[PDB]
Fold this sequence. Notes:
The structure is cut from a larger assembly and holds chains A (89 residues) and B (513 residues).
Chain A: E1 3-8, E2 11-14, E3 51-53, E4 59-61, H1 62-71, E5 86-87
Antiparallel strand pairs in A: 3-4, 3-5
Chain B: H1 2-19, H2 27-44, H3 54-58, H4 62-72, H5 78-97, H6 107-129, H7 133-147, H8 153-166, H9 175-189, H10 194-208, H11 218-228, H12 236-263, E1 271-272, E2 275-278, H13 295-310, E3 326-330, H14 343-352, H15 358-361, H16 371-377, E4 389-391, E5 404-406, H17 430-458, H18 468-474, H19 485-493
Antiparallel strand pairs in B: 4-5
Bound molecules: zinc ion (3 copies).
PDB class: ligase
Keywords: ligase, complex
Entry title: Cryo-EM Structure of the KBTBD2-CRL3~N8 dimeric complex
Amino acid sequence: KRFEVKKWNAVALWAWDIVVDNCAICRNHIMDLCIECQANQASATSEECTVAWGVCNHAFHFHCISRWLKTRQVCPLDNREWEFQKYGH
Amino acid sequence: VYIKKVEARINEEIERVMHCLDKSTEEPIVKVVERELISKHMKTIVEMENSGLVHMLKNGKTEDLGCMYKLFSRVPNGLKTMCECMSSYLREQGKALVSEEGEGKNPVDYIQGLLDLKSRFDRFLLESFNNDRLFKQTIAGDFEYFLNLNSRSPEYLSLFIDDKLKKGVKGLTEQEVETILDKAMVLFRFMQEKDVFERYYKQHLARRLLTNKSVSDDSEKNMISKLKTECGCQFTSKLEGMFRDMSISNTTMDEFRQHLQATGVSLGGVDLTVRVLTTGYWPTQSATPKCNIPPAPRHAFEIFRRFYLAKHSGRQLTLQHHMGSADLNATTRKHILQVSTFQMTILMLFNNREKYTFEEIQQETDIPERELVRALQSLACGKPTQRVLTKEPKSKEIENGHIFTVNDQFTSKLHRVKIQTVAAKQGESDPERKETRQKVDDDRKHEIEAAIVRIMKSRKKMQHNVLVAEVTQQLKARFLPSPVVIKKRIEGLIEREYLARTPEDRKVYTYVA
Ligand SMILES: [Zn+2]
Ligand SMILES: [Zn+2]
Ligand SMILES: [Zn+2]
């Protein structure tokens, strides 16, 4: 051939999905609604009740970390103050 | 010469009064002498003309400033007008230096001149004013007032710190580097809009740790150190995490070579340099496109993805093109070209089939917008004697039927000739910068919300809006550029419990946490 690639230097970005099967705050699921959307109300309609992603890469129902951010504010699965790096799965 | 004469007069007067007169004899004498001489000469001798206070400070007379400080320190209200005239001269010099009318100014030279002026005034202070608190406070206030005049000041300083961090060619030793960095952070201490100073410094971090390697090594750790202090650990943790994750990148790249010797299914992995970064520190460039990949890079990316999914499960990778580089081995000698993970696709399409065109690189490539034009002109437009990409219909504008050709152009005897034209500097553009700065403002406003509400429900709640003063004091240097976002935010937030403030009933709130 006339031109052959020798070196390459791509940079590859990533995003881990923590145990996508439940929530550590209300113990229900990663999605499929929460305790404030199954027992609190039944309609569960028009509910952007979605998953929240931290910088520590843990995941909970948006609602369940918002209710946890009332009294405490430091992510229950480590100690990091916890940010908000995503919304949805 | 008047100051030396009046000093000699005061000396001879006090000597005559202490030797020829009684034992105390001095309090009212010196009081009236000062009130007559200095209280009258203070207004006119320092501002009128002909080498007063401004001129004797402009030329740099150390003894004059020293004797004026040691003389006017005895009479009250002297240092006041002294610092007033000094601040007036500082404002004049700043407005003469921070002048925005006129394009074609070098940012690094501007920051260098500002730092030289600051160091000159600091030297004058230390040499004459004997480190007086009033002069320091006045110069600090003046630097705070005259610097936030332009919004490109933090951007100009970030470019300067990038030029100083990319290579320590000037000042090979560490002492002067340390001093210049201390002076730089001191200059930054009296700066505003530091939220984009951080955003543009993170843009520079990305430019210095993605387009090249081994920038300063230990001096980048010197940077994280001088950063930890400054305004306190709140925006410095960001830099800490960024550097920790670039360490993650290098370690994961070694891990990749190691276990690619394990997921090896092809040979497109001759020489690979893959970097693993996190999206929580590095923003998406424009759109993270999904263009095609040459076959040997295809095999390399497949091997890397298989390895990252086998031995690094729990996360999936995303493909992009707007980052990186490559070395295209061309072939009378074998000169190796360079394609910033940008000319790789076009050159590969030229290999697969020559005589290609725009209707060929824009149709069967899934190529992004005008960034594509800038990546393409890097080989053809504005090229010296290294034009490796030529064309038949040579025209400034790009039609759709411009066939392409490759010129040998045997001039660069080096076997590593690179085509660098894109990303000349790092000034960006007015709109995108503005919108991302507004995004940083909204993020800081969410910070406000959280902070105030949580603290107040445990740490003293307010009546109407009185602790808001405290939360804005916490984020003082990070408050200016946002308009009324905070007001609209606390408004949309009044919905559930743990927060009242309702305009109807803003009384004593709950006391939980
Ligand atoms: Zn939950
Ligand atoms: Zn819910
Ligand atoms: Zn966590």
